[PDB]
Structures are given as structure tokens and as C-alpha cells.
Write a protein that binds this ligand. Structure first.
Ligand SMILES: Nc1nc2c(ncn2[C@@H]2O[C@H](COP(=O)(O)OP(=O)(O)OP(=O)(O)O)[C@@H](O)[C@H]2O)c(=O)[nH]1
Ligand SMILES: Nc1nc2c(ncn2[C@@H]2O[C@H](COP(=O)(O)OP(=O)(O)O)[C@@H](O)[C@H]2O)c(=O)[nH]1
Ligand SMILES: COc1ccc(/N=N/c2cc(OC)c(OC)c(OC)c2)cc1O
Ligand SMILES: [Ca+2]
Ligand SMILES: [Mg+2]
Lengths: 437, 426, 155
């Protein structure tokens, strides 16, 4: 048992964090007041769910989570929602004035006024740990706080916790539900500055989750509720191995070993199946081979791209529910050859498999139907360079005219930081191209 | 970002500022005395943005009234909402300005600026989360233009990080044939280019053409023009006064609408056009981008859109708004700058304005606005070349170089709009 | 010099003083440093009575200043319709051109004095007169989108 601390920054990270922790409580059997009847060891324990929940003397299970935002509106919804009594009151930290969708306001001017308090409160959660292994950080790419404060936080975390792992859940901006025109600028600025301080980052493309909601769930105009319900279901599948017994990705270090061959290319792609509307409650159950096959279909990816284009450097299959091991090996065998799936010449052309024999949990009020078996594939493919090529293009268009740049310079930032960030990006795209495509 | 401080200067500033409080207060269910007679809890969400709670479950508008002419005191005071304002928020002089930008900015109005800052500090000190300021005035007169810009500069010195927002009415000979107004307008534009973050250009030439040629008003009156104004000030401020997705943040609007600091002059538009006693989503969207529905006398088809905001109001299909909006951008892609991706922002609001069930407000940063500035610059140049009435201004201390520097500063502004209208990403 | 007091007298609209100085031999056609006669100033500040009296006492209705402005240029610019007609009644050249190539029609169109436009046209104002930049009264109407002006110039 080694503890993980989850940090949620800005509206995007906070709202998605609220949905995840709700789901965490349902999968583990924790009541919104924090009571876990099925926990015979009151006041403490070495169980696998204790990596995410601490315990009080009175039998309260409190998430090891911290919520930070530069305005209080979104966090106020967390202090008055259902699970208001679950979180530490002092782990919900809010400012007064937000970063105005401005990376510089979140990193230099505004963010600078709360970064010390954020660290102290984090440091309080760490002192309660007997073997902290690292942090999970939820933030948006396009918000001023999600980008600017988060880069600043990551920098501070490498100083005070140099040996601990830092994983990322990042929201990739999509125009169908965007907020700011400068979101490409903030995306590039935070990537470049967080790149050397992040061990592994799972990007969530709002456009991918949006389309999935419209096609599979027949939702005409998906909102942030619908989007986050599905993200929380996928996040749950990535962090399940850390919260349950298992033999694949049991600790944060193992995320890097299996998915990140080289430090800079730490952007694995996540694919999940099946997604079925709760209106089809009597659906026919998909087979282990059916859901497995769907993990190589671009339409189910958490980031829009075409893995047919690139090469695979690592693949992990995390199954949940009624899944017989021999049925997975048979599914792999055929799909290995029945499709143009190309690994790099320098990697063991294999698949890692872990099975959790409990079906996924669904939350009351959600858009998904219950399923007997599901799978989340985590893969590192050079095809996710396509996502970067889309960001960098939108960046280049505006920066060529220097559009919106004065807003950044007037808030402590220096104009040279734009160019070196864009070069760093240009290098990242050639990192994937030197691997193959 | 919450409280905003309203300031109205001069006859036009108070004349359109008063109507603003009459319109929005009716939307928030605030009777003339200040009591909330509304039947919806949404009418009180973002109420503190424009009002104060002064006990008794009442709301005193956070407004400051100024004018060198004491006559404006009676007009506003004797209005249907003249008593809901603070008696302490009345700063009025004994001497007018007489269409002299100099008297308002250098002599008369200057002596009256310190007192105005007093009532401004009184309001800000009592603000729990002050975000910025908004000033209504004309640019042709002497008080609102000459003194209003001086007060803008003073406030910005004390509140340098707050947002300064202005509703500036542009002079037109169609409504007031005074030959010294191009002077005042040009001298003011010189100030507004430096010391404000967002400026709504409300053009008397466009207001007159809408009433005369569209509203069928052979002899339009300041009441007819102000009706179109009041409705526009309510639409552009809808998201600051009611819940919705377009957050409620003057600074996030300025971050997304102003790509270059000097290009912060917005062309408003409103649809449908209505009179004073007197259509689906496709019409609203289409009509919004029609030259006849613009509050500034310029044809958007003559230039390119840098950024655009659209505020829809009323019960309406939300997916239908995303479809039709997406359509006009494609059919009119030649009129948007390609080097600013996703430069169009949309949002709906539930509560529409009185008399209407579904409206739309258009706020555009468009290079075609240079036409408005070309008009004023021509008239300024005609008068300056003859030195007509320059002694009215130099007699108050101004140096002749202020006219030239002001005239050069505006020609540069025009050159700047033209530069990004022909700028291509391919 | 009575020429100097007649310039101020006309500028400030002192009718009684204008009459007095003329009885003592004041130069009705004196000019200031820039070439402005009393008739220029009377036409600028809209002193209709001083304009009619000067014209009855030898004032040159077509005098120009150093910049080429005739009294009718300044009256058309400033927007004094009564004075425009009086000056036209006395042989003022409706198509006089100044050093910017502007005629009386140009200034009236720019400043929006639509009444004065119709009077100049009715007295022979040349609609094909271009300025130093090739603009004519109609061109100014098209470039500024003034529909009222354009219809009047088309008639
Ligand atoms: N999936 C998802 N995306 C969100 C959510 N909230 C915001 N976003 C996305 O995040 C981006 C906007 O960033 P925000 O998280 O709202 O900004 P922020 O971190 O609060 O920073 P500031 O508000 O500017 O101080 C846009 O791309 C949104 O689509 C959410 O609840 N779910
Ligand atoms: N739209 C509108 N414009 C006005 C109104 N009153 C005056 N104006 C314009 O404002 C200009 C005169 O400036 P004014 O405000 O009266 O001078 P001030 O007293 O020094 O501020 C003229 O060009 C008028 O056309 C009004 O009620 N509505
Ligand atoms: C070019 O793309 C964009 C253009 C405008 C955008 N936002 N605009 C607003 C407009 C507002 O009121 C009019 C707000 O109310 C004060 C407002 O507060 C949040 C934002 C957003 C864009 O991503
Ligand atoms: Ca226990
Ligand atoms: Mg925010």
C-alpha cells in the first residue's frame, strides 16, 4: 500500500474530479458521509483502496484529494453538493479573481498569490502518508488556471517531492464546447513548461468525448455533465489498478515502465468500450472479442487520431467484469494479424493484460447502461502526434500576426516565451517522427 | 469579478444612462422605488453587479451622475427613475461646456474632476469584488467628451488593473449640425484609444438612418434614437446581469474580443428592429449580420470580422442556434479573418427583454469600423484646414499640436484596421 | 489702424461699431495676417447683418485669403444658409476653388449641410469638380455612404 494524492485545478479539473470521486465511492462502497460498512479495520488499514482514501478514528473515509481554483464559484458547488461531507473542508482552496483565460495570469501574477497555501495544504496530506508514491493532476489545457497555475504547481512539486511520480489528466480543447479564443496559446505554453516535470499524461480530447456522446449515447447537444460522466468512467478504468488487487500497473512507477519508452513521449492514448445508452437497457452483451476489437476503432478513442497511421510502442489491456483469460488470448491472436497493427522494431511486440473480475459501476442519473464486461486499452502510438499538429497549427495562425499576445506580456510574461514554447513543440512532433509514422 | 460602477457624463450620457437603468431595472423586477416585484429567482442572481443592497430589501443602482450643466439635474431627477439614484451621487456644475471639449477637459471640467473621484472612491470602497467601470457619454459635446475622457484617465490611474468600459455615442450632422463636433469627437477618440479596454460605438448617423429609412421616422427624436440604444445596452450586458454560459466577466470578454490593444472599438447590432409602441432563429442570425441592423454606420461586407460575440435571448432551440450560426460563418467565410480560428462565440440567455420573446445582440470587432473613423476624420480635416474656431480651443490652454497629434493618431488607427483587413494567412 | 478694429468688429458681430468705423474711412477690404477680410469673418461667424452692409460698401465678395478661401467657401463650410444666398445674390463665384481643390460644393457635402448643397446646385455648382485627390461632390457621397447626399446630387 502506497498513497496517491489527486490534485484538481480550475473548473475543468474540479468538475471532473467531483464526478470521479463520486464514482470511486460507488465502486468501493463508500457512503457520501464517508462511512464504509464493509471496512472491518476502523481507524486505518493497508488495503488497496487506502491509496486513495485515508481513515479517521471514527470510521470516516476521506479522499486524498485537493481542489484549487482562482475563483470560488465551481468549488462552492462542491461544498454544497451531495458529497459535501466527504472532503476535508481545508482541501477546497479558492481565490477571488481567476486567470481570465490567460496563461500568464495563472502562472505569474494571480497564481503567485495562492501557490504557497496550496503547497502547505498538500504538504499536510503528505505528512499523513507512510509511503507516498506521487500525484494525479486534473486540469484543462485551455483555461488560464488549468494551464498557468498548473505549470507553476508542477514546477513546485518537482522541488519539494523530487522522487515522487506525477501523472496528468489533461483536457484538450475542442471548439464545440470551448471557452476562449486563446486556448491554443495556453495549451502550448503549459505543455512546454510542464513537459519535463510530468512522468505520464493522459490527454482527453473534448471533441472525442463530445462525438462519442452524440453517436453512442444519442445525445443531441452534450453538456459538461454528460462529458464528465464518461470521462469519470474512463479515468476510473485507468486508476482501477491502483485501487484494487491486480498484477498490471499496480503502482505509479509501473505506468512509466509499460507505457513511456522515453521521457518526452509520455502521452498514451486511451480507448474504451463499450459505450451503450441507458435507454438500451436490454442490449445484447458484447463478447470479449467484440469489445477487444472495438479498442482499435478510432471512433472509441479518447483523443481523435488514426492509430493506423503511426506505430505502436506499448499496449496495455485493462478488462473489468466477466472475462475469461483464454478468451482474451484468442481475441489478441486474431486481431494481431487480422489488422494492420504495426509495432516499432525496437519494442517487444506484445500486449500486457490485467483482468478485474468485477463489472463496471454506473452512477444513478448517468447516460451509460450496465455491461457485463468492459475494457480500457492504454497505448503509446506515434499517431497522437496528430493532436499536437492540430494545436500547433492553430497556435501558428494567431502568433504570426501576434494576435492576443499583448494580454500575455502585460501580465509578467515575456514575449520570448512564446517562441521557445513553439520550438519545444516542433521538437516534440519530430520526436514522434524519429520513432516512425 | 462582480461589482461594476456606472458613470454617466453630460446631457447625452445621462439621457441614455437613465434609460439604461429604466430598462434593465424593469428586467430585474425593480420598481421605481427599488423594491423587487419580480416573480423569478433568476432576476436576483447577478443583481449585485449593477445594484447595491441598502437595507429594506432594496437596491440602489451603483451609478454616478455628472454634468457641468445644472439643467440635467432636473431632467434625470424628474424622470420616472430619478429618485432611485443616490442624492450623494449627483455631481453637477454651475457652468456648461458649450460644445467646447477644452472647457470640459482642461478648465471647467478639470476643477470638477476631484469631486467626481470622491463619489467614485465611495462606491469602490464599498465593493466586495469590484471588476471595472462603464461610462456613457457622447463624443461631440464638451462635457461627456472632454471631461469624460479626463475622468477616464484619472480613474485608470487609481484603478490601473480594473476594466474601463465605455458606451460612446458618435456625432453625426444628421442629428446635430454643429461643425465643432468633429473636433471634440477626434480629440476624444485620441484619448479612448489609450485609456479604455472596451468601447461600444453607438453612431448617431446609424441611429438616424434606422429610424428614418427603416423605422419610418421622418423626424426622428432623441427618444427614438435612445430606444435603439437602450435595447442595445441591455443586450450587450445580458450575460453580466443573468445566469448563463457566457460567464459574467468583463476581463474575459476583453481577452477574447480584443486581439490588438488599440482595436477595442466594438460595432454593436440588434435584431429585430422595433419602434416605441409597435421571426425565428434563422432570421435573428441572418438579420444580426445585416448592415441595417448595426448601431454604427458601416457595412460589415466592406471589411473582415476579427472577433464576434452573439447574445441570443429567449426560449429557443439551442441546437438550432449552433446550426444556423455555423451556417452564416461558412456562407460568409470571406468576411472573417482566417488567422483567428473559432473567432465567433455564441451563447443563449433565458429571460428575453420586455415586449420581445426572442432577440439577438451582435458585438463585433470588425475592420469595417474604419469607415466610421474615416467619416469623422474627413470632417475634422475640412475644419482644421481652415482653422475654423481654433481660438475657441487654444483660448483655454490647448496647443495646436493636440489637434494634429489627434488627427495623426486616428489616421494611424484607420491604417491599422486596413492592415489586418488585407492581412492573409492564405 | 481702423482696418484692425473693423476685423474684430466684424468677427464679434458689432453692427453699430462696423457702421461707425466705415464712416471714418475704415478699409472695408482690409485683411489680417492670413488674408481674411472683414467679409470672410462676417461669413464665418454667421453675422448676416454685417455681411449685407459690407457688400453695400465695396467689399470684394470674391476675395481669397492666403489659402484661397473665398467668403463663400467659409459660409458653405460653417453652414450659414442665409449668408450663402446673400453672397450668391452678389456675384460670389459658386465654383471658386481653393488650394486643396475644394469648391463650395465640396465643403457643404463633407459637413452634411444638405440645404446648402441644394442651393449651390440650383446656382450652377459644378458636380464634376475634383479636388487634389480626384474626389468630386458625388464621390464624397459614395465613399461616406451618405444616401441623402447622393440622392440630392443625382436629382
Ligand atoms: N470535459 C470538460 N471540460 C471542461 C469542463 N469545464 C471546463 N472545460 C474545458 O476547459 C476549457 C476552459 O478551461 P477552464 O477549466 O474552464 O478554465 P480555468 O481552469 O478555470 O481557468 P480560468 O477560469 O481562466 O481562471 C475549455 O476547453 C472547456 O471546454 C468540464 O467540466 N468538463
Ligand atoms: N443618441 C443620443 N445622442 C445624443 C442625445 N443627446 C445628445 N446627443 C448627442 O451628443 C452630442 C452633444 O453632446 P452633449 O452630451 O449634448 O454635450 P455635453 O453636455 O458636454 O456632454 C450631439 O452630437 C448629440 O447628437 C441623446 O439623447 N441620444
Ligand atoms: C473569439 O472568441 C470569443 C469571443 C468572445 C467570447 N466571450 N465573450 C463574452 C461576452 C460577454 O458579454 C458580451 C461576456 O459577459 C461579460 C463574457 O463574459 C465571460 C464573455 C469568447 C470567445 O471565445
Ligand atoms: Ca480500514
Ligand atoms: Mg475558471
Amino acid at each position: 500500500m502506497r498513497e496517491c494524492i489527486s490534485i484538481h485545478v480550475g473548473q475543468a479539473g474540479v468538475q471532473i474530479g467531483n464526478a470521479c470521486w463520486e464514482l470511486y465511492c460507488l465502486e468501493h462502497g463508500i457512503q457520501p458521509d464517508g462511512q464504509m460498512p464493509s471496512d472491518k479495520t476502523i481507524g486505518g488499514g493497508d488495503d488497496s483502496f487506502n491509496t486513495f482514501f485515508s481513515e479517521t478514528g471514527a470510521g470516516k473515509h476521506v479522499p486524498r484529494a485537493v481542489f484549487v481554483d482562482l475563483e470560488p464559484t465551481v468549488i462552492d458547488e462542491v461544498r454544497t453538493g451531495t458529497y459535501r461531507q466527504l472532503f476535508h473542508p481545508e482541501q477546497l482552496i479558492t481565490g477571488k479573481e481567476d486567470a481570465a483565460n490567460n496563461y500568464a495570469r495563472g502562472h505569474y501574477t494571480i497564481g503567485k498569490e495562492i501557490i504557497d497555501l496550496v503547497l502547505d495544504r498538500i504538504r499536510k496530506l503528505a505528512d499523513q502518508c507512510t509511503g507516498l508514491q506521487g500525484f494525479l493532476v486534473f486540469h484543462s489545457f485551455g483555461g488560464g488556471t488549468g494551464s498557468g497555475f498548473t505549470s507553476l504547481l508542477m514546477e513546485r512539486l518537482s522541488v519539494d517531492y523530487g522522487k515522487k511520480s506525477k501523472l496528468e489528466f489533461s483536457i484538450y480543447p475542442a471548439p464545440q464546447v470551448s471557452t476562449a479564443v486563446v486556448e491554443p496559446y495556453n495549451s502550448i505554453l503549459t505543455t512546454h513548461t510542464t513537459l519535463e516535470h510530468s512522468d505520464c499524461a493522459f490527454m482527453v480530447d473534448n471533441e472525442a468525448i463530445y462525438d462519442i456522446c452524440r453517436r453512442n449515447l444519442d445525445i443531441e447537444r452534450p453538456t459538461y455533465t454528460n462529458l464528465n460522466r464518461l470521462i469519470s468512467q474512463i479515468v476510473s478504468s485507468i486508476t482501477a489498478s491502483l485501487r484494487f488487487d491486480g498484477a498490471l500497473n499496480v503502482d505509479l512507477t509501473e505506468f512509466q515502465t509499460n507505457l513511456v519508452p522515453y521521457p518526452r513521449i509520455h502521452f498514451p492514448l486511451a480507448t474504451y468500450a463499450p459505450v451503450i445508452s441507458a435507454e438500451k437497457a436490454y442490449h445484447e452483451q458484447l463478447s470479449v472479442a467484440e469489445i477487444t476489437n472495438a479498442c482499435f476503432e478510432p471512433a472509441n478513442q479518447m483523443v481523435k487520431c488514426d492509430p493506423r497511421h503511426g506505430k505502436y510502442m506499448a499496449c496495455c489491456l485493462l478488462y473489468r467484469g466477466d472475462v475469461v483469460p483464454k478468451d482474451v488470448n484468442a481475441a489478441i491472436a486474431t486481431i494481431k494479424t487480422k489488422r494492420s497493427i504495426q509495432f516499432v522494431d525496437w519494442c517487444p511486440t506484445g500486449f500486457k493484460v490485467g483482468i478485474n473480475y468485477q463489472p463496471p459501476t454506473v452512477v444513478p442519473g448517468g447516460d451509460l447502461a450496465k455491461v457485463q464486461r468492459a475494457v480500457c486499452m492504454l497505448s503509446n502510438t506515434t499517431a497522437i502526434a496528430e493532436a499536437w499538429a492540430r494545436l500547433d497549427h492553430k497556435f501558428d495562425l494567431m502568433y504570426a500576426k501576434r494576435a492576443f499576445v499583448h494580454w500575455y506580456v502585460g501580465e509578467g510574461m515575456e514575449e520570448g516565451e512564446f517562441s521557445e514554447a513553439r520550438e519545444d513543440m516542433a521538437a516534440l512532433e519530430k520526436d514522434y517522427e524519429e520513432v516512425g509514422v | 469579478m462582480r461589482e461594476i460602477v456606472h458613470i454617466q457624463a453630460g446631457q447625452c450620457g445621462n439621457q441614455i444612462g437613465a434609460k439604461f437603468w429604466e430598462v434593465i431595472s424593469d428586467e430585474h423586477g425593480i420598481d421605481p422605488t427599488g423594491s423587487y416585484h419580480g416573480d423569478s429567482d433568476l432576476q436576483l442572481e447577478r443583481i449585485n453587479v449593477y445594484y447595491n443592497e441598502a437595507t429594506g430589501n432594496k437596491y440602489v443602482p451603483r451609478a454616478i451622475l455628472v454634468d457641468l450643466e445644472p439643467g440635467t439635474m432636473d431632467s434625470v431627477r424628474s424622470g420616472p427613475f430619478g429618485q432611485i439614484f443616490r442624492p450623494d451621487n449627483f455631481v453637477f456644475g454651475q457652468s456648461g461646456a458649450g460644445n467646447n471639449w477644452a472647457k470640459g477637459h482642461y478648465t471647467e471640467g478639470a476643477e470638477l474632476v476631484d469631486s467626481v473621484l470622491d463619489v467614485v472612491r465611495k462606491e469602490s470602497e464599498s465593493c466586495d469584488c469590484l471588476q471595472g467601470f462603464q461610462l456613457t457619454h457622447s463624443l461631440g459635446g464638451g462635457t461627456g467628451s472632454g471631461m469624460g475622457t479626463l475622468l477616464i484617465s484619472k480613474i485608470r490611474e487609481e484603478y490601473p488593473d480594473r476594466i474601463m468600459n465605455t458606451f460612446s455615442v458618435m456625432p453625426s450632422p444628421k442629428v446635430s449640425d454643429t461643425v465643432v463636433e468633429p473636433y471634440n469627437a477626434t480629440l476624444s477618440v485620441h484619448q479612448l484609444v489609450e485609456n479604455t479596454d472596451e468601447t461600444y460605438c453607438i453612431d448617431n448617423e446609424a441611429l438616424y438612418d434606422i429610424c428614418f429609412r427603416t423605422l419610418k421616422l421622418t423626424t426622428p427624436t432623441y427618444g427614438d434614437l435612445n430606444h435603439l440604444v437602450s435595447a442595445t445596452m441591455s443586450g450587450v450586458t445580458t450575460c453580466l446581469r443573468f445566469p448563463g454560459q457566457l460567464n459574467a466577466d468583463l476581463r474575459k470578454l476583453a481577452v477574447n474580443m480584443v486581439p490588438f490593444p488599440r482595436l477595442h472599438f466594438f460595432m454593436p447590432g440588434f435584431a429585430p428592429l422595433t419602434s416605441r409602441g409597435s421571426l425565428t432563429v434563422p432570421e435573428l442570425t441572418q438579420q444580426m449580420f445585416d448592415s441595417k441592423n448595426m448601431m454604427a454606420a458601416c457595412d460589415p461586407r466592406h471589411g473582415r470580422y476579427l472577433t464576434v460575440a452573439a447574445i441570443f435571448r429567449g426560449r429557443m432551440s439551442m441546437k438550432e442556434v449552433d446550426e444556423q450560426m455555423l451556417n452564416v460563418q461558412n456562407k460568409n467565410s470571406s468576411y472573417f479573418v482566417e488567422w483567428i480560428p473559432n473567432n465567433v462565440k455564441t451563447a443563449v440567455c433565458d429571460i428575453p427583454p420586455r415586449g420581445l420573446k426572442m432577440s439577438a445582440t451582435f458585438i463585433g470587432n470588425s475592420t469595417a469600423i474604419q469607415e466610421l473613423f474615416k467619416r469623422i476624420s474627413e470632417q475634422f480635416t475640412a475644419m482644421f484646414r481652415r482653422k475654423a474656431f481654433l481660438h475657441w480651443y487654444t483660448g483655454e490652454g490647448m496647443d495646436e499640436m493636440e489637434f494634429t497629434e489627434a488627427e495623426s493618431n486616428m489616421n494611424d488607427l484607420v491604417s491599422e484596421y486596413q492592415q489586418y483587413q488585407d492581412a492573409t494567412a492564405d | 489702424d481702423l482696418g484692425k478694429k473693423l476685423l474684430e468688429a466684424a468677427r464679434a458681430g458689432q453692427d453699430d461699431e462696423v457702421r461707425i468705423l466705415m464712416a471714418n474711412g475704415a478699409d472695408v477690404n482690409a485683411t489680417d495676417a492670413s488674408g481674411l477680410t472683414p467679409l470672410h469673418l462676417a461669413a464665418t461667424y454667421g453675422h448676416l447683418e454685417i455681411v449685407e452692409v459690407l457688400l453695400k460698401h465695396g467689399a470684394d465678395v470674391n476675395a481669397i485669403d492666403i489659402m484661397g478661401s473665398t467668403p463663400l467657401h467659409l459660409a458653405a463650410l460653417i453652414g450659414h444658409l442665409e449668408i450663402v444666398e446673400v453672397l450668391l445674390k452678389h456675384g460670389a463665384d459658386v465654383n471658386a476653388v481653393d488650394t486643396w481643390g475644394d469648391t463650395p460644393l465640396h465643403l457643404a457635402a463633407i459637413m452634411g449641410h444638405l440645404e446648402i448643397v441644394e442651393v449651390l446646385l440650383k446656382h450652377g455648382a459644378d458636380v464634376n469638380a475634383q479636388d487634389k485627390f480626384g474626389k468630386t461632390a458625388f464621390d464624397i457621397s459614395i465613399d461616406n455612404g451618405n444616401e441623402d447626399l447622393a440622392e440630392i446630387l443625382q436629382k
